[PDB]
mmCIF file of C-alpha atoms in Angstrom:
data_model
loop_
_atom_site.group_PDB
_atom_site.id
_atom_site.type_symbol
_atom_site.label_atom_id
_atom_site.label_comp_id
_atom_site.label_asym_id
_atom_site.label_seq_id
_atom_site.Cartn_x
_atom_site.Cartn_y
_atom_site.Cartn_z
ATOM 1 C CA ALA A 12 55.546 172.815 -47.233
ATOM 2 C CA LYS A 13 51.259 173.254 -47.341
ATOM 3 C CA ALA A 14 48.681 172.201 -45.415
ATOM 4 C CA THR A 15 48.455 168.665 -46.181
ATOM 5 C CA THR A 16 44.669 168.315 -46.889
ATOM 6 C CA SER A 17 44.253 165.056 -46.991
ATOM 7 C CA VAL A 18 47.070 161.642 -46.076
ATOM 8 C CA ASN A 19 46.166 158.328 -47.165
ATOM 9 C CA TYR A 20 46.590 155.207 -46.003
ATOM 10 C CA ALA A 21 47.588 151.736 -47.387
ATOM 11 C CA UNK A 22 48.962 148.362 -46.666
ATOM 12 C CA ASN A 23 47.778 145.460 -44.434
ATOM 13 C CA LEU A 24 46.505 144.696 -41.640
ATOM 14 C CA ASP A 25 46.836 140.887 -39.249
ATOM 15 C CA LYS A 26 43.977 139.338 -38.868
ATOM 16 C CA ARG A 27 44.938 136.925 -36.688
ATOM 17 C CA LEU A 28 45.652 139.930 -34.429
ATOM 18 C CA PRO A 29 43.944 138.654 -30.551
ATOM 19 C CA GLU A 30 41.388 140.260 -28.989
ATOM 20 C CA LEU A 31 41.403 142.277 -26.259
ATOM 21 C CA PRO A 32 39.482 141.118 -22.575
ATOM 22 C CA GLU A 33 39.031 141.609 -19.444
ATOM 23 C CA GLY A 34 40.046 145.699 -20.890
ATOM 24 C CA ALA A 35 43.201 143.712 -21.164
ATOM 25 C CA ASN A 36 46.505 145.410 -19.079
ATOM 26 C CA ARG A 37 49.215 146.474 -20.579
ATOM 27 C CA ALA A 38 51.241 144.270 -22.334
ATOM 28 C CA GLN A 39 47.770 142.727 -23.715
ATOM 29 C CA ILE A 40 46.911 145.445 -25.339
ATOM 30 C CA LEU A 41 50.124 146.183 -27.258
ATOM 31 C CA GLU A 42 49.518 142.938 -28.480
ATOM 32 C CA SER A 43 46.741 143.622 -30.535
ATOM 33 C CA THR A 44 47.305 146.831 -31.001
ATOM 34 C CA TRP A 45 49.203 147.975 -34.659
ATOM 35 C CA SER A 46 49.983 151.513 -34.841
ATOM 36 C CA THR A 47 51.442 154.091 -37.219
ATOM 37 C CA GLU A 48 52.472 157.459 -36.975
ATOM 38 C CA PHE A 49 53.412 160.354 -39.064
ATOM 39 C CA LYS A 50 54.433 163.647 -39.642
ATOM 40 C CA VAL A 51 52.394 166.749 -41.063
ATOM 41 C CA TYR A 52 52.217 170.289 -41.366
ATOM 42 C CA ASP A 53 49.641 172.605 -40.601
ATOM 43 C CA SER A 54 48.506 176.311 -42.504
ATOM 44 C CA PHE A 55 51.612 178.410 -40.805
ATOM 45 C CA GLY A 56 54.162 176.191 -41.499
ATOM 46 C CA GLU A 57 54.277 173.802 -38.676
ATOM 47 C CA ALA A 58 55.793 170.947 -37.941
ATOM 48 C CA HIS A 59 52.774 168.537 -36.748
ATOM 49 C CA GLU A 60 52.989 163.425 -36.118
ATOM 50 C CA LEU A 61 49.802 162.345 -36.832
ATOM 51 C CA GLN A 62 49.527 158.792 -34.822
ATOM 52 C CA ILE A 63 46.379 156.059 -35.532
ATOM 53 C CA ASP A 64 46.273 152.879 -33.039
ATOM 54 C CA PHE A 65 44.432 149.895 -34.993
ATOM 55 C CA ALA A 66 43.467 146.909 -32.688
ATOM 56 C CA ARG A 67 40.461 143.812 -32.939
ATOM 57 C CA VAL A 68 37.583 145.516 -31.480
ATOM 58 C CA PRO A 69 36.757 142.469 -28.871
ATOM 59 C CA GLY A 70 33.574 140.382 -29.474
ATOM 60 C CA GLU A 71 33.122 141.130 -33.009
ATOM 61 C CA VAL A 72 35.523 139.491 -36.243
ATOM 62 C CA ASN A 73 36.883 141.541 -38.534
ATOM 63 C CA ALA A 74 36.591 145.740 -37.445
ATOM 64 C CA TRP A 75 38.590 147.592 -36.218
ATOM 65 C CA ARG A 76 38.792 150.148 -33.193
ATOM 66 C CA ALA A 77 41.513 152.880 -34.537
ATOM 67 C CA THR A 78 41.924 155.854 -31.964
ATOM 68 C CA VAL A 79 43.544 159.533 -33.326
ATOM 69 C CA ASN A 80 46.140 161.200 -31.198
ATOM 70 C CA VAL A 81 47.567 164.335 -33.554
ATOM 71 C CA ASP A 82 50.628 164.967 -31.323
ATOM 72 C CA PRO A 83 50.397 162.780 -28.309
ATOM 73 C CA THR A 84 52.261 164.214 -25.521
ATOM 74 C CA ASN A 85 49.031 166.242 -25.309
ATOM 75 C CA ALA A 86 46.898 164.875 -23.350
ATOM 76 C CA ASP A 87 43.767 166.491 -23.610
ATOM 77 C CA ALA A 88 44.712 169.891 -25.873
ATOM 78 C CA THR A 89 44.485 169.478 -29.609
ATOM 79 C CA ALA A 90 40.796 168.024 -28.931
ATOM 80 C CA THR A 91 40.887 165.890 -31.732
ATOM 81 C CA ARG A 92 38.413 164.170 -33.564
ATOM 82 C CA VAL A 93 37.332 162.439 -36.603
ATOM 83 C CA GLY A 94 34.227 161.843 -38.238
ATOM 84 C CA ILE A 95 33.201 160.608 -42.301
ATOM 85 C CA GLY A 96 31.325 163.778 -42.158
ATOM 86 C CA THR A 97 29.876 165.573 -38.826
ATOM 87 C CA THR A 98 32.745 166.643 -36.720
ATOM 88 C CA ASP A 99 31.172 167.961 -33.270
ATOM 89 C CA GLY A 100 29.230 165.087 -32.332
ATOM 90 C CA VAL A 101 32.346 162.925 -32.138
ATOM 91 C CA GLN A 102 35.355 161.044 -30.383
ATOM 92 C CA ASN A 103 38.360 160.113 -30.869
ATOM 93 C CA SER A 104 37.611 156.757 -33.076
ATOM 94 C CA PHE A 105 35.861 155.034 -36.087
ATOM 95 C CA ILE A 106 35.941 151.599 -36.080
ATOM 96 C CA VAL A 107 36.501 150.037 -39.170
ATOM 97 C CA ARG A 108 34.973 146.546 -40.581
ATOM 98 C CA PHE A 109 36.768 144.170 -43.434
ATOM 99 C CA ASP A 110 34.349 141.881 -45.985
ATOM 100 C CA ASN A 111 34.976 138.294 -46.514
ATOM 101 C CA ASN A 112 38.148 138.470 -48.797
ATOM 102 C CA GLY A 113 40.132 141.392 -46.749
ATOM 103 C CA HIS A 114 38.386 144.661 -48.653
ATOM 104 C CA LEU A 115 37.402 146.991 -47.911
ATOM 105 C CA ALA A 116 33.552 147.529 -46.231
ATOM 106 C CA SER A 117 32.550 150.195 -43.812
ATOM 107 C CA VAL A 118 33.961 152.521 -42.059
ATOM 108 C CA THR A 119 31.203 153.610 -38.609
ATOM 109 C CA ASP A 120 32.823 156.792 -35.958
ATOM 110 C CA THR A 121 30.856 157.430 -32.290
ATOM 111 C CA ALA A 122 27.963 158.572 -34.100
ATOM 112 C CA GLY A 123 26.143 155.658 -36.526
ATOM 113 C CA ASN A 124 27.228 157.750 -39.891
ATOM 114 C CA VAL A 125 27.846 155.505 -42.531
ATOM 115 C CA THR A 126 30.070 155.361 -45.248
ATOM 116 C CA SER A 127 27.835 154.865 -48.444
ATOM 117 C CA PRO A 128 28.513 151.121 -50.152
ATOM 118 C CA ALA A 129 30.730 152.324 -52.528
ATOM 119 C CA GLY A 130 34.136 154.928 -53.801
ATOM 120 C CA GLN A 131 36.418 156.230 -52.317
ATOM 121 C CA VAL A 132 36.323 156.821 -47.712
ATOM 122 C CA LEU A 133 37.528 159.475 -46.057
ATOM 123 C CA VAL A 134 37.150 159.876 -42.146
ATOM 124 C CA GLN A 135 38.472 164.132 -41.719
ATOM 125 C CA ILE A 136 40.495 164.848 -39.022
ATOM 126 C CA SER A 137 40.211 167.670 -36.855
ATOM 127 C CA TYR A 138 42.090 169.418 -33.888
ATOM 128 C CA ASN A 139 43.573 172.682 -32.326
ATOM 129 C CA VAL A 140 46.867 173.553 -34.242
ATOM 130 C CA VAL A 141 49.237 175.342 -30.948
ATOM 131 C CA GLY A 142 52.370 175.798 -29.540
ATOM 132 C CA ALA A 143 51.921 179.904 -28.495
ATOM 133 C CA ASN A 144 53.719 181.441 -32.577
ATOM 134 C CA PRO A 145 53.405 185.574 -32.333
ATOM 135 C CA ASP A 146 50.448 187.113 -33.348
ATOM 136 C CA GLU A 147 47.452 185.551 -32.140
ATOM 137 C CA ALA A 148 45.076 182.780 -33.237
ATOM 138 C CA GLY A 149 42.067 182.869 -30.915
ATOM 139 C CA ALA A 150 39.163 181.529 -30.636
ATOM 140 C CA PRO A 151 40.383 177.596 -29.649
ATOM 141 C CA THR A 152 40.852 177.726 -34.041
ATOM 142 C CA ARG A 153 41.219 174.048 -35.455
ATOM 143 C CA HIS A 154 42.479 172.433 -38.797
ATOM 144 C CA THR A 155 40.705 170.289 -40.811
ATOM 145 C CA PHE A 156 42.554 167.414 -41.858
ATOM 146 C CA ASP A 157 40.633 163.966 -44.206
ATOM 147 C CA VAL A 158 42.163 160.382 -44.191
ATOM 148 C CA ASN A 159 42.294 158.482 -47.163
ATOM 149 C CA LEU A 160 40.929 155.276 -46.910
ATOM 150 C CA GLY A 161 40.882 153.986 -49.774
ATOM 151 C CA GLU A 162 37.870 152.543 -52.233
ATOM 152 C CA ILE A 163 36.083 149.652 -50.871
ATOM 153 C CA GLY A 164 36.153 146.317 -52.201
ATOM 154 C CA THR A 165 39.029 146.730 -53.013
ATOM 155 C CA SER A 166 42.791 145.815 -52.802
ATOM 156 C CA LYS A 167 44.644 148.853 -55.199
ATOM 157 C CA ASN A 168 46.209 151.612 -52.477
ATOM 158 C CA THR A 169 43.022 150.585 -49.697
ATOM 159 C CA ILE A 170 43.963 148.682 -46.454
ATOM 160 C CA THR A 171 43.026 145.275 -46.351
ATOM 161 C CA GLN A 172 43.351 142.591 -43.514
ATOM 162 C CA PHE A 173 44.316 139.778 -45.219
ATOM 163 C CA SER A 174 46.412 136.664 -42.263
ATOM 164 C CA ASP A 175 49.808 138.031 -43.202
ATOM 165 C CA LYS A 176 52.200 140.491 -41.361
ATOM 166 C CA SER A 177 50.713 143.742 -40.797
ATOM 167 C CA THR A 178 51.411 146.540 -42.976
ATOM 168 C CA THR A 179 49.149 149.446 -43.146
ATOM 169 C CA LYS A 180 51.092 152.803 -43.069
ATOM 170 C CA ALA A 181 50.772 156.453 -44.620
ATOM 171 C CA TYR A 182 52.257 157.593 -48.248
ATOM 172 C CA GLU A 183 51.731 160.928 -49.565
ATOM 173 C CA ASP B 20 46.922 155.145 -67.668
ATOM 174 C CA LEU B 21 47.144 152.274 -66.095
ATOM 175 C CA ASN B 22 49.744 152.093 -63.093
ATOM 176 C CA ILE B 23 51.550 148.833 -61.440
ATOM 177 C CA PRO B 24 53.397 149.706 -58.799
ATOM 178 C CA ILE B 25 56.034 147.774 -57.080
ATOM 179 C CA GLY B 26 54.556 146.487 -53.863
ATOM 180 C CA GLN B 27 51.267 146.498 -54.980
ATOM 181 C CA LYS B 28 49.409 144.091 -53.496
ATOM 182 C CA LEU B 29 47.540 139.824 -55.286
ATOM 183 C CA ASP B 30 44.111 139.368 -53.132
ATOM 184 C CA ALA B 31 44.434 136.002 -51.468
ATOM 185 C CA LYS B 32 43.377 132.458 -53.405
ATOM 186 C CA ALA B 33 40.497 130.343 -51.263
ATOM 187 C CA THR B 34 41.812 127.009 -52.359
ATOM 188 C CA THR B 35 39.239 125.454 -54.805
ATOM 189 C CA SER B 36 40.817 122.586 -56.174
ATOM 190 C CA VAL B 37 43.771 119.955 -53.892
ATOM 191 C CA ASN B 38 45.498 117.626 -56.293
ATOM 192 C CA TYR B 39 46.749 114.410 -53.386
ATOM 193 C CA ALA B 40 47.929 111.069 -54.225
ATOM 194 C CA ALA B 41 49.262 109.407 -51.617
ATOM 195 C CA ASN B 42 49.653 104.946 -51.465
ATOM 196 C CA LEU B 43 48.554 103.467 -47.747
ATOM 197 C CA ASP B 44 50.524 100.626 -47.083
ATOM 198 C CA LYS B 45 48.760 97.291 -47.653
ATOM 199 C CA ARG B 46 51.125 95.190 -46.115
ATOM 200 C CA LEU B 47 49.012 97.058 -42.929
ATOM 201 C CA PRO B 48 46.939 94.218 -40.845
ATOM 202 C CA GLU B 49 43.850 93.272 -40.939
ATOM 203 C CA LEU B 50 41.509 94.604 -38.797
ATOM 204 C CA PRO B 51 39.344 91.287 -37.154
ATOM 205 C CA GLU B 52 35.148 92.939 -37.535
ATOM 206 C CA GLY B 53 35.443 93.566 -33.990
ATOM 207 C CA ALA B 54 39.428 95.274 -33.122
ATOM 208 C CA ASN B 55 39.929 97.774 -30.251
ATOM 209 C CA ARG B 56 41.135 100.516 -30.769
ATOM 210 C CA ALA B 57 44.772 99.927 -30.063
ATOM 211 C CA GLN B 58 44.709 97.626 -33.314
ATOM 212 C CA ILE B 59 42.431 100.053 -35.342
ATOM 213 C CA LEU B 60 45.774 102.285 -34.917
ATOM 214 C CA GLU B 61 47.940 99.481 -35.725
ATOM 215 C CA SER B 62 46.526 99.285 -38.864
ATOM 216 C CA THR B 63 45.633 102.772 -39.805
ATOM 217 C CA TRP B 64 47.543 105.530 -41.567
ATOM 218 C CA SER B 65 46.962 109.656 -40.958
ATOM 219 C CA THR B 66 48.293 112.694 -42.917
ATOM 220 C CA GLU B 67 47.916 116.459 -43.104
ATOM 221 C CA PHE B 68 48.630 119.648 -46.088
ATOM 222 C CA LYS B 69 47.481 122.814 -46.326
ATOM 223 C CA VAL B 70 44.176 124.907 -47.832
ATOM 224 C CA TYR B 71 43.598 128.099 -48.114
ATOM 225 C CA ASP B 72 40.751 130.817 -47.338
ATOM 226 C CA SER B 73 39.672 133.587 -48.467
ATOM 227 C CA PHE B 74 41.281 135.539 -46.082
ATOM 228 C CA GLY B 75 44.686 133.843 -47.153
ATOM 229 C CA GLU B 76 44.879 131.509 -43.388
ATOM 230 C CA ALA B 77 46.142 128.274 -44.500
ATOM 231 C CA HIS B 78 43.827 125.864 -42.016
ATOM 232 C CA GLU B 79 45.211 122.580 -42.002
ATOM 233 C CA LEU B 80 43.849 119.670 -43.168
ATOM 234 C CA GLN B 81 44.365 116.171 -42.321
ATOM 235 C CA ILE B 82 43.119 112.274 -42.905
ATOM 236 C CA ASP B 83 43.124 109.548 -41.485
ATOM 237 C CA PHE B 84 42.961 106.480 -42.896
ATOM 238 C CA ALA B 85 42.294 103.417 -41.448
ATOM 239 C CA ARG B 86 41.435 99.717 -42.588
ATOM 240 C CA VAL B 87 37.175 98.760 -42.733
ATOM 241 C CA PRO B 88 36.962 95.952 -40.601
ATOM 242 C CA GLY B 89 36.911 92.393 -41.740
ATOM 243 C CA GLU B 90 36.603 93.995 -44.908
ATOM 244 C CA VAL B 91 39.335 93.661 -47.216
ATOM 245 C CA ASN B 92 41.067 96.514 -49.037
ATOM 246 C CA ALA B 93 38.432 98.953 -48.386
ATOM 247 C CA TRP B 94 39.788 101.633 -46.664
ATOM 248 C CA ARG B 95 37.496 104.573 -43.888
ATOM 249 C CA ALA B 96 39.280 108.101 -44.853
ATOM 250 C CA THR B 97 38.312 110.757 -41.679
ATOM 251 C CA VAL B 98 38.693 113.984 -42.579
ATOM 252 C CA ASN B 99 39.162 117.240 -39.899
ATOM 253 C CA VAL B 100 40.345 121.209 -41.257
ATOM 254 C CA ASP B 101 41.661 122.431 -38.432
ATOM 255 C CA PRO B 102 41.846 119.328 -35.926
ATOM 256 C CA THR B 103 42.238 120.900 -32.946
ATOM 257 C CA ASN B 104 39.313 122.615 -32.896
ATOM 258 C CA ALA B 105 37.937 120.491 -35.267
ATOM 259 C CA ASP B 106 34.225 120.882 -33.672
ATOM 260 C CA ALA B 107 33.613 124.176 -34.184
ATOM 261 C CA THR B 108 34.826 123.843 -38.249
ATOM 262 C CA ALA B 109 31.946 120.462 -39.025
ATOM 263 C CA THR B 110 33.876 119.250 -41.485
ATOM 264 C CA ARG B 111 32.402 116.733 -44.659
ATOM 265 C CA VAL B 112 33.289 115.454 -47.395
ATOM 266 C CA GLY B 113 30.612 113.228 -50.176
ATOM 267 C CA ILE B 114 30.365 113.342 -53.883
ATOM 268 C CA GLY B 115 28.618 115.313 -54.999
ATOM 269 C CA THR B 116 27.149 117.027 -51.920
ATOM 270 C CA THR B 117 28.205 118.584 -48.652
ATOM 271 C CA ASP B 118 24.911 118.679 -46.912
ATOM 272 C CA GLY B 119 23.519 115.617 -45.075
ATOM 273 C CA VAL B 120 25.982 113.855 -45.257
ATOM 274 C CA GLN B 121 29.627 113.414 -43.119
ATOM 275 C CA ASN B 122 32.933 113.827 -42.319
ATOM 276 C CA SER B 123 34.225 110.494 -43.776
ATOM 277 C CA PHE B 124 34.097 108.357 -46.911
ATOM 278 C CA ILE B 125 36.105 104.845 -48.110
ATOM 279 C CA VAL B 126 37.852 104.561 -50.587
ATOM 280 C CA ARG B 127 37.718 100.939 -52.293
ATOM 281 C CA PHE B 128 40.779 99.488 -53.650
ATOM 282 C CA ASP B 129 40.852 97.825 -57.244
ATOM 283 C CA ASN B 130 42.698 94.212 -57.485
ATOM 284 C CA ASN B 131 46.341 95.470 -59.177
ATOM 285 C CA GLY B 132 46.428 98.285 -56.337
ATOM 286 C CA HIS B 133 44.545 100.906 -58.204
ATOM 287 C CA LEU B 134 41.383 102.647 -56.796
ATOM 288 C CA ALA B 135 38.696 101.116 -57.205
ATOM 289 C CA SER B 136 35.778 103.351 -56.224
ATOM 290 C CA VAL B 137 34.667 106.090 -53.366
ATOM 291 C CA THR B 138 31.256 106.132 -51.159
ATOM 292 C CA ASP B 139 30.735 108.279 -49.559
ATOM 293 C CA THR B 140 28.115 107.795 -45.879
ATOM 294 C CA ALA B 141 25.409 108.883 -47.815
ATOM 295 C CA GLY B 142 25.124 106.329 -50.693
ATOM 296 C CA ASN B 143 26.370 108.316 -53.048
ATOM 297 C CA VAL B 144 29.199 106.690 -54.435
ATOM 298 C CA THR B 145 31.420 107.776 -57.155
ATOM 299 C CA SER B 146 31.270 106.066 -61.174
ATOM 300 C CA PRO B 147 32.872 102.947 -62.595
ATOM 301 C CA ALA B 148 35.629 105.308 -64.156
ATOM 302 C CA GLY B 149 36.311 108.697 -64.440
ATOM 303 C CA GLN B 150 38.687 111.074 -62.000
ATOM 304 C CA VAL B 151 37.169 110.756 -59.402
ATOM 305 C CA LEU B 152 36.182 114.473 -57.216
ATOM 306 C CA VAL B 153 35.085 114.333 -53.178
ATOM 307 C CA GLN B 154 33.433 117.608 -52.313
ATOM 308 C CA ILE B 155 35.111 119.240 -49.001
ATOM 309 C CA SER B 156 33.213 121.571 -46.821
ATOM 310 C CA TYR B 157 34.557 123.215 -43.729
ATOM 311 C CA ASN B 158 33.127 125.974 -41.224
ATOM 312 C CA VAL B 159 35.606 129.657 -42.374
ATOM 313 C CA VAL B 160 36.118 130.003 -37.885
ATOM 314 C CA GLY B 161 36.676 134.054 -39.525
ATOM 315 C CA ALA B 162 34.311 134.673 -41.676
ATOM 316 C CA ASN B 163 30.925 136.876 -41.413
ATOM 317 C CA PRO B 164 28.558 134.832 -41.556
ATOM 318 C CA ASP B 165 25.901 135.253 -44.534
ATOM 319 C CA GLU B 166 22.969 137.254 -45.865
ATOM 320 C CA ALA B 167 20.752 134.474 -43.918
ATOM 321 C CA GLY B 168 23.072 134.296 -40.966
ATOM 322 C CA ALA B 169 24.811 131.274 -41.249
ATOM 323 C CA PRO B 170 28.117 130.726 -40.510
ATOM 324 C CA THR B 171 29.995 130.877 -44.510
ATOM 325 C CA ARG B 172 31.781 128.152 -45.500
ATOM 326 C CA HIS B 173 34.545 127.178 -47.207
ATOM 327 C CA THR B 174 34.587 124.800 -50.371
ATOM 328 C CA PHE B 175 36.763 123.024 -52.793
ATOM 329 C CA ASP B 176 37.150 119.412 -53.963
ATOM 330 C CA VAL B 177 39.674 116.760 -53.964
ATOM 331 C CA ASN B 178 41.477 115.237 -56.364
ATOM 332 C CA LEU B 179 42.341 111.800 -56.051
ATOM 333 C CA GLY B 180 43.519 111.166 -59.749
ATOM 334 C CA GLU B 181 41.542 108.818 -62.342
ATOM 335 C CA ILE B 182 39.914 104.952 -61.380
ATOM 336 C CA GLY B 183 42.080 102.351 -62.035
ATOM 337 C CA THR B 184 45.614 104.524 -62.701
ATOM 338 C CA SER B 185 48.923 105.862 -60.788
ATOM 339 C CA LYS B 186 51.184 108.095 -60.769
ATOM 340 C CA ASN B 187 48.280 111.104 -60.730
ATOM 341 C CA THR B 188 45.455 109.133 -58.332
ATOM 342 C CA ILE B 189 45.590 107.088 -55.326
ATOM 343 C CA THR B 190 47.248 103.526 -55.063
ATOM 344 C CA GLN B 191 47.114 100.353 -52.467
ATOM 345 C CA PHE B 192 50.331 99.187 -53.506
ATOM 346 C CA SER B 193 52.188 97.293 -51.079
ATOM 347 C CA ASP B 194 55.169 98.313 -49.185
ATOM 348 C CA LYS B 195 55.357 102.297 -48.282
ATOM 349 C CA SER B 196 53.432 104.597 -46.991
ATOM 350 C CA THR B 197 53.523 108.257 -47.999
ATOM 351 C CA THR B 198 51.834 111.366 -49.702
ATOM 352 C CA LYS B 199 53.024 111.590 -53.472
ATOM 353 C CA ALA B 200 51.540 114.692 -54.927
ATOM 354 C CA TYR B 201 50.239 117.631 -53.841
ATOM 355 C CA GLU B 202 49.139 120.375 -55.797
ATOM 356 C CA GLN B 203 46.794 123.211 -54.545
ATOM 357 C CA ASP B 204 45.616 126.413 -56.291
ATOM 358 C CA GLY B 205 45.087 128.472 -53.403
ATOM 359 C CA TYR B 206 47.356 130.822 -51.803
ATOM 360 C CA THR B 207 48.033 134.279 -49.106
ATOM 361 C CA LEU B 208 47.850 137.968 -49.775
ATOM 362 C CA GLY B 209 51.566 138.930 -51.724
ATOM 363 C CA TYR B 210 52.767 141.675 -53.142
ATOM 364 C CA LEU B 211 54.551 142.265 -55.988
ATOM 365 C CA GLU B 212 58.111 142.902 -56.074
ATOM 366 C CA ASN B 213 59.903 142.868 -59.622
ATOM 367 C CA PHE B 214 58.668 141.811 -63.518
ATOM 368 C CA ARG B 215 60.647 139.412 -65.316
ATOM 369 C CA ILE B 216 60.928 138.616 -69.128
ATOM 370 C CA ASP B 217 61.160 136.471 -71.513
ATOM 371 C CA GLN B 218 62.606 135.289 -74.191
ATOM 372 C CA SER B 219 59.048 135.649 -76.484
ATOM 373 C CA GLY B 220 58.062 138.801 -74.972
ATOM 374 C CA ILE B 221 56.199 138.404 -72.043
ATOM 375 C CA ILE B 222 56.082 140.444 -69.586
ATOM 376 C CA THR B 223 55.329 138.746 -66.183
ATOM 377 C CA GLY B 224 55.505 140.409 -62.676
ATOM 378 C CA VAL B 225 55.903 138.794 -59.445
ATOM 379 C CA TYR B 226 54.326 138.298 -56.415
ATOM 380 C CA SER B 227 56.088 138.245 -52.817
ATOM 381 C CA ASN B 228 53.714 134.534 -52.537
ATOM 382 C CA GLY B 229 55.223 133.078 -55.823
ATOM 383 C CA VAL B 230 52.333 133.834 -58.080
ATOM 384 C CA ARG B 231 53.751 135.325 -61.313
ATOM 385 C CA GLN B 232 51.147 137.293 -63.377
ATOM 386 C CA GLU B 233 51.307 138.443 -67.028
ATOM 387 C CA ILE B 234 50.193 142.051 -68.333
ATOM 388 C CA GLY B 235 51.324 141.449 -72.427
ATOM 389 C CA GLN B 236 54.133 141.199 -75.266
ATOM 390 C CA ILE B 237 55.937 143.178 -77.544
#
């Protein structure tokens, strides 16, 4: 039990998942959304859930929108934003792209800052932790996170997008 | 140190080479030089086998072996990757190239049955002897374009055999029409499942797509 500092993600997303035309309805988005659920800890020692929904962006191949929401039951609160470098000029989504071999290629968040052409890919998560607790935290108070998708150009401990069943999950 | 975890991934290998061989029935009737679509049908034989792109997607490659009209011991092979979407994949099959040729070729048979020669539509013919390789190309629909903007293509060869033999070569012997041999070297994504040791000390890893890679020996 620690401030989780980082969460490594790996495994495969299926290329064959279809797009989301029309702003498709409830049953169609679920047919094209792979989700992953994980458990994490804050500075104090409280247990929170980290959920990331992966779904193909309509109109662009090999590109995925990942929506992150810690404690998804809790709408609006916790804020929850993700953003590579920066973290107030961004929402709770980032768009991950893959290259013609199924290997990780790029991450881009709500703003325009993109990951470097090489090296490990970190995205950073940010939320307000609440749940009463006796002595006060004051102000919005937050908890940055760091999520490790792996390193570009490789499949070792990295997510991949091949035409096989989806397998992406969190580890350590 | 180098670590080899179980459930480690093995990227997909796109097909580069297919080894195909089949026999076309010679006792199929010949085609007069101007037949209709039902008569080319009763003198054609089609088949299908898989190839793999670099995402590990299997594409069904379909070949229709139709008799050349009038001319005998000659068949025409119309090739199509992904036949239900044959127009967008735009297959092209030549000898030595795939630029500026159509998705078809003619294959003439030796008087004994053995593969004589193969000629594309551009005029590119085999050589009189040796193994015959047919270059095949198409659009990988799901691939990102290249640096220039082109829709990216997957290119591989089809080894029909060597001129004048059988066993591992295509034939036109009399009755029986089927596929003999199909060996292609591509495969889909795979995961490391377990290690296996050998009467030698050679430790291999086996993957879920049955690939079997080695590491070293004792």
